[PDB]
Amino acid sequence: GEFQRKLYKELVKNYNPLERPVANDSQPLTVYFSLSLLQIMDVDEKNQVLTTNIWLQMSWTDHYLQWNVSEYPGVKTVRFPDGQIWKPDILLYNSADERFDATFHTNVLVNSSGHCQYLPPGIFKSSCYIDVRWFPFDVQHCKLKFGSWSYGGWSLDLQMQEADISGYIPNGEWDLVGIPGKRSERFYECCKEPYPDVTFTVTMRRRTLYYGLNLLIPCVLISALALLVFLLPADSGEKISLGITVLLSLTVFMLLVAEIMPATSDSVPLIAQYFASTMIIVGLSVVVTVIVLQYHHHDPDGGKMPKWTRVILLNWCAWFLRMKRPGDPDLAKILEEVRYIANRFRCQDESEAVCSEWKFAACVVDRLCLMAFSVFTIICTIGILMSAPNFVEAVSKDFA
Amino acid sequence: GEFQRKLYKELVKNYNPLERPVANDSQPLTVYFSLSLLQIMDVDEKNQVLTTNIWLQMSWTDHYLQWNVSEYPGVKTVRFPDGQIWKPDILLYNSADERFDATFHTNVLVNSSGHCQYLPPGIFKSSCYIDVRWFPFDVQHCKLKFGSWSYGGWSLDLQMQEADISGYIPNGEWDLVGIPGKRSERFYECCKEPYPDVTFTVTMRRRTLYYGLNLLIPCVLISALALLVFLLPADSGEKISLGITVLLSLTVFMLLVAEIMPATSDSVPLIAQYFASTMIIVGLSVVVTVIVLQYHHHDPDGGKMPKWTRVILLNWCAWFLRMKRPGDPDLAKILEEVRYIANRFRCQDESEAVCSEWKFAACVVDRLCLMAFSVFTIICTIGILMSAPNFVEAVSKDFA
Amino acid sequence: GEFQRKLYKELVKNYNPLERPVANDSQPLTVYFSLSLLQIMDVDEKNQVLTTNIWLQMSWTDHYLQWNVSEYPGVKTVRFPDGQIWKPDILLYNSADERFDATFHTNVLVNSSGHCQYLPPGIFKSSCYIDVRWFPFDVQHCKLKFGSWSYGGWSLDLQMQEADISGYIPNGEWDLVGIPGKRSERFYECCKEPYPDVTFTVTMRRRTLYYGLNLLIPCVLISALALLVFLLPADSGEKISLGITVLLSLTVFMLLVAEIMPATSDSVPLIAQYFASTMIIVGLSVVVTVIVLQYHHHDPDGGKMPKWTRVILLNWCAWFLRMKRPGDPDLAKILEEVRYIANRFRCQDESEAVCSEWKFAACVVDRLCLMAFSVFTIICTIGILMSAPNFVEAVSKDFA
Amino acid sequence: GEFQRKLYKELVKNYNPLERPVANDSQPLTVYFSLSLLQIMDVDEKNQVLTTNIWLQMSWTDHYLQWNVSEYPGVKTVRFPDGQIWKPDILLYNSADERFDATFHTNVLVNSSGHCQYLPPGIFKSSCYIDVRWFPFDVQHCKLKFGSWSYGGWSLDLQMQEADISGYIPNGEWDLVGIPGKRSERFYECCKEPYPDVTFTVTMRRRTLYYGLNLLIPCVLISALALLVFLLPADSGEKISLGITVLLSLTVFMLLVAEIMPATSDSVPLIAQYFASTMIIVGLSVVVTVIVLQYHHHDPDGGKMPKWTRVILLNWCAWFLRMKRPGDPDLAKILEEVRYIANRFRCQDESEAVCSEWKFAACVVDRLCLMAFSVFTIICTIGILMSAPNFVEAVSKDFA
Amino acid sequence: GEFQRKLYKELVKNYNPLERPVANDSQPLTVYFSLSLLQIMDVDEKNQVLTTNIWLQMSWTDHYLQWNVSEYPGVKTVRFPDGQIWKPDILLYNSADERFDATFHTNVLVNSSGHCQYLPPGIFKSSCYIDVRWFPFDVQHCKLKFGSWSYGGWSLDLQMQEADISGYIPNGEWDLVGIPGKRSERFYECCKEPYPDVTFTVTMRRRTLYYGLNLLIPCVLISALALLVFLLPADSGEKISLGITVLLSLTVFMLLVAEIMPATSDSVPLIAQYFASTMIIVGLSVVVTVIVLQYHHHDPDGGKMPKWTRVILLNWCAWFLRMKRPGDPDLAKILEEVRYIANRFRCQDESEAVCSEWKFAACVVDRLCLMAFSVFTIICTIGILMSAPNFVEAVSKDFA
Numbered sequence A, B, C, D, E: 001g002e003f004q005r006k007l008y009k010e011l012v013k014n015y016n017p018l019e020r021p022v023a024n025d026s027q028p029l030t031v032y033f034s035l036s037l038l039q040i041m042d043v044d045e046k047n048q049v050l051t052t053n054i055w056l057q058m059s060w061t062d063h064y065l066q067w068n069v070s071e072y073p074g075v076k077t078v079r080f081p082d083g084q085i086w087k088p089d090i091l092l093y094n095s096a097d098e099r100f101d102a103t104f105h106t107n108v109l110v111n112s113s114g115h116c117q118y119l120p121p122g123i124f125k126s127s128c129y130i131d132v133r134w135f136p137f138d139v140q141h142c143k144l145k146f147g148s149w150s151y152g153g154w155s156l157d158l159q160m161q162e163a164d165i166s167g168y169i170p171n172g173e174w175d176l177v178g179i180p181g182k183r184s185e186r187f188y189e190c191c192k193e194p195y196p197d198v199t200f201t202v203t204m205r206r207r208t209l210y211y212g213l214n215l216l217i218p219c220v221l222i223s224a225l226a227l228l229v230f231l232l233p234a235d236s237g238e239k240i241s242l243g244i245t246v247l248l249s250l251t252v253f254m255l256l257v258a259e260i261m262p263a264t265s266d267s268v269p270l271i272a273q274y275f276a277s278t279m280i281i282v283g284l285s286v287v288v289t290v291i292v293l294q295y296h297h298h299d300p301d302g303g304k305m306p307k308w309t310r311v312i313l314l315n316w317c318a319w320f321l322r323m324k325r326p327g328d329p330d331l332a333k334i335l336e337e338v339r340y341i342a343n344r345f346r347c348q349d350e351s352e353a354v355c356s357e358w359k360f361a362a363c364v365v366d367r368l369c370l371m372a373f374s375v376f377t378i379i380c381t382i383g384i385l386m387s388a389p390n391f392v393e394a395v396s397k398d399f400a
């Protein structure tokens, strides 16, 4: 239309995009800043980078871009592209992107009275410290710092508007708690100039269903299965094989899990503590199984049971465990032969009884060690998990 | 040619690319929007990104770019590059690309009467929520939202044309069902201005042959092989070794499969349910094998069989399982010697029979547990799979 | 030089880069298209993308860029950069790159009579469907489609020149067969305008030495080693352990191989068929070994051999397998004692013979199952491989 | 404001951005250079690239960009974008980025008297040689070299300002020691022109908690568990199985650890030395276990114990190890029969004693080898770790 | 300064950046080309791409950019940015980068007499065929081809200057041998125009310490450990378990090593040959162990030793191996009873001797196979390694 063509011709006359559009040069220009969170794409634990989808919101009043609607009927708003009008240089201070300005520069919508709007979308990759002390029950507070790169408070004073979460898309791995923010003023040393900024901090809570189903349950199941060695009779030769195979499975699960948590060194993760406890328990179980095996295959002709060990185990433990311990010249010549055979059989029988007593001693230490290790593992696996804060809330939310 | 040179010189005179080309400034400009789906490249389950090959289609009528063919014989169409004529700022709202405008800006083809065409190709990376509750039998509905970034309904009203799938290239992993779309109007709070848009939703069905051949069949084969422990005689010492080796193979297959599904926590995947069932069954089988082994190697001098257990197993189970349970002074001196030897042999024989009865008890509990576990595994592996909807359609399409 | 400076000043006067340089506006402009294949970089099986190194070749006659050599002695050719002269907008239709125009825009070399040459190099990432039905013996036909994005046949008619392979660099993984191409005309619905294009299809054959050395040979070696269980005496307790360990090795090799082939679901790959056959054979071998073991440790006091089974195995199989089956009052008191001892020994001997006959039955079923499984595995591993076409040519080329 | 508009109009008149702004052409221009370290993002060991977050600081005095504040009240500073004023071409010499200039060009802030400030942020990817001789106890010195690309000392002399670490964000994997720097002058061959530069070297110390918890502790635990073979009685058949299973676990841990350290060949890493020692110890333990087993199952009818071996082991080792070694015609016919039986039993008994002596010899070599291997492993695992410098400081910092 | 401002104003008057700056249009322009190698970043074996850090060096004499120093005191050199003066279009012909021009365009330094210098840095990704026939002892010759894209020899004749390696940074994985180069002329078919170019070929030698420490030593150690099966007594039941466990470890090491070498099919790598030899040796050892086991557990009631086998083994091998092979009516009734018992014992004793002879035969074949396999493995592992050329030089450089 000729009206809007004339308006466009008149507006850009003697216009400098390098000039702050204010009526009085000694007064600042008010700029309103806000956010519109859309999607939390990736929370990188290893490299400490949070990737989000954000719609920036800026608004300010211009002095030169005004006109009378009556003179130009039918046209109410005009649009200007990049590099033709002045716009604030608001930048994310703590960015972690190769292109520091990750905003797709769109048009600028203008009032009939100078008010401007600017909503550049973009995917931001900030840098926030991530704590995994209570992983996978952690709650993080990542920050987004925004401010003018070169303008001062006496020239450009930012104002904060409450963040928008209306169009937020829920994420299946992180539960958003809230995104508060507040305006802050930072004075300098030389000069009384304030330097306003708007900082938005994101609070999100990890959803624990996936890890609780794929790591805690299977690992505790293998740990429980490792206790069966104490219920296996020593006559079969599968005790050490079974124990070492559970150890191998635990090592494989360690290999599977090693790639998730980062390489931090500020605090030992809860998953690391629990896995160390489990592997130590399994190793101790293997040691006990070896001791029991060396008790069972004890040589009957070796040293006899010491009185202290006998009275300690076979009496006291049996009392506590409620188990019962099992239990003519030719005529002379043949007489000596049968006597020798009978005495040989008698010696064999007494040696067999001597071996049986050691077998019973091994069988009675086995159940004691079973009870001890069962109590140890249940207590450890309860305490380690219940130590972490907000565990009850996490299991109330992600399981019910 | 001099004719087209003159036409080009005349057309761009007093032309502003920042002006909406309409005859009346108070009336909107009609713009037709459409799509031409070409290829579904990648469906990223973990990061929830769908990558497609798309040819956008836009068309509108211009008012200033008209001429008489008689005045310029031989020339019917003209082409303009980027930044020389006004074009709509149609953008994908829900994009997930670093460059928000992933369209390769091509030329604009012009009528002899102002009609314009614009087909910018590009590879789009949208963000759509992906459900894996019925994985790998899922059907997803990803959306593509298109609309003007700054223009209003009173100025630019979009119109929807049916999508084109003529040049669609079939994908070996996803089966396209259809790509419908409809125009929608969104009114604002202040003002009665409609804000039209065109949303295209893609419906695709996963092809299940690959997963059904590489995951379900091998895993169920190992699960079936794990049942052989109940057919292995207890005299050989390979029962625990075999069971724990099947457990190790299952753990390795878990490690192989862990990397496919995402880390969501909204619903337990069907593959997760089935794998948990299989591993629980294998663990219970190992427990039963340990119990059977401790029954087989029971000490003959220990506690006798309780009457309740004897009558429950050896009579009732044998009835049900249809198996039969197996079954001169020197003269005095030598007489006592041979009597002692004979009595020793008699005691050994009765102890052997006592042990044989326990061996039979173990052999008869073994088959009962075999039957129970076989029924359990077949019922579980049938119910878990048949629970998912459209399973019959999936196996009718991807297997016949 | 002043001559070339004057020529450059004169040439660009009143020149519009948006005008088709033709003498008559109603006639088309002939443009010759060709290719110069240089290197096949990557053939992506999973995402179906072929990456090549290409030198495009374009040539056309210009009408405004002509001069007399006598007027400008010493200068024969001139060069123009991007955006200063008109060049055809030839684009790869089926591209799979974020930047749809993957050509590095170089200069344009000009005749003294208007003829132009343009050779923009670039690395192209097209999208071609890849078949892995006969993997790793496949032969693929990937296509490259080239044509003007907006110009018509009445204005710009493409002409095809034979492709150049003089500077082709041989690839160690793919053997190039040839790169033919032909010109095609596509008429529209409204109008009799042809729309010419040039399509180049690449035919390449996979080199099979690497896969044939790293997958087929080792896997068949483990499959052959799995047959040794039938030559192992049952007295040793390593049969089940050996079989399950070969199964574990096969599972590990499956894990190694799983990452190569794509996730397609249109056809079962030959490698998948062969691996399924091998794993099924190994599982059946384990089942047979369990059956043999349960035959060997059969209780001598259990049910006797059925007559049918005895005559079927011990007679017929031995006939076929050519193996031979192995084979004073005190005086009265001592008389009864020695009689009892002798009768006990006699019963023990007959029970031992009864057990020996079952041991022989197991030993004779073992060799029969060995022969059956050996024939099965050799026949399967020959037929599966020889089923694929061009197998003889592949082994003649990549092995001799 | 009209004042700042007039000032902007006056400043850029007859201004050439290609001219060095100095009053006297024969004198150099002083430029101050500094740094503001913000974050150490990634220390790439394999490809030797250090990625940091840096805010460059430059300052210099301009001669043409001056004005009187009284003539232009209310305006004190002006800002200029890229390409409108002259700025130094300071570049990182030893960069490892595809875009050699990884700085986001921001505005330039100007005094009222010509002084300029320029703080372009960016993420830098330098290339510094990384030493892993003492990994994971290493301390690296990566360098950042900055200097003008084309200007000389007689025209542009750099000056160094101390680095800023006020806004440094601590990293969980690297502990920053300090970032010193100094100015250096490099004369040329032809000409007495100095060429100043500023080099900043970063000193950082690796935090060892993660590796010390996930690699050293578990590996030494498996190494200790491998010693249990010497406490396992030889009667059970799990010695070789246990040893080879610990070997398999060690191989799996090698596979897990192989991907961390780079592929350098200048020095053997400490972790490589320690792992080689551990695997050699385990292999030697397996060899000793095989020797002990072949001693235990020695045939009683074979060669007798040599006198030298007997006196060396059974006497001296028992002295040192303090273990005790265990310990009528018919009448004639029956007489000969019982005599034959008794002599058979006597020969069996003496053969059993002969075998028992070899069993004791194996049992006594077992404990000697246990002691030797325990001393070897503890000494090796102490010396290898304590060899590295700053080990005490590392364990004092990262563990207390 | 006003002098340099005036000089800049005068220089760019009537200057065309599209004109070759020569005094005579019919004469060529001499351009000197050189290189400054800085760092070899990555040598990609799989995709055949060599990434380097390069400083290009170009120099030529300009005719229009000259001035008198007396007229402009104090200014000796001027700098021009991209796109304001003519510069040669030297491009790397065999590039493998998406951006074909990987040079960061810097300024151009100018004499007071027209001489120009241009040093654009950049990271280049060329494409050179990589041979791995002798991996990891290979020496590669990658090439870098440079030449003008459109200018001819009659207009632009390149001249080669020797490469610079003063600032070369040593690489821990590749040892640079040298970077020679030579100028070459390529005539065309139509015309006698030479087309000069400068080609630089890089010769580098791989450092073998890392591979020689992590692959050859551990693999040969496992291969040596696999030979212990022949020193293990057959009475213990760990022979097959040990052999199959070494096989499993070898398979795991194959999985670890599979990802290093590329997927070429032109030649079998030395590492592939050696690994195939090792796995074949281990498989043959397992086969021999099975044969020995089936000899040891031979049934005493089966077929007797054939005379040929007896004389071949028990005599000849024992000769060669120097081992010795081990070694009143009631009165009648009791007489018959004791006679029967004695005859039973005699038959048992002779059967035991018959079994002992087979046990000795197995024990004597075991050591023969041990010697054979030891000789085989040492000879193979020496010959395969020593076959490769420059092996002695590699072990002299990377080990001493």
Ligand SMILES: *[C@@H]1O[C@H](CO)[C@@H](O[C@@H]2O[C@H](CO)[C@@H](O)[C@H](O)[C@H]2NC(C)=O)[C@H](O)[C@H]1NC(C)=O
Residues within 6 Å of the ligand: C111, C112, C113, C115
């Ligand atoms: C314009 O360029 C073309 C080739 O690049 C030249 O035309 C060729 O000339 C030769 C000799 O007459 C013929 O054999 C060819 O058939 C021609 N090819 C084509 C495509 O026409 C021509 O020489 C150049 N013109 C000038 C003045 O140099």
Ligand SMILES: *[C@@H]1O[C@H](CO)[C@@H](O)[C@H](O)[C@H]1NC(C)=O
Residues within 6 Å of the ligand: A023, A024, A025, A026, A027
């Ligand atoms: C600008 O502000 C100052 C004080 O705030 C005042 O003295 C001056 O008059 C103002 N100038 C204009 C044009 O309003």
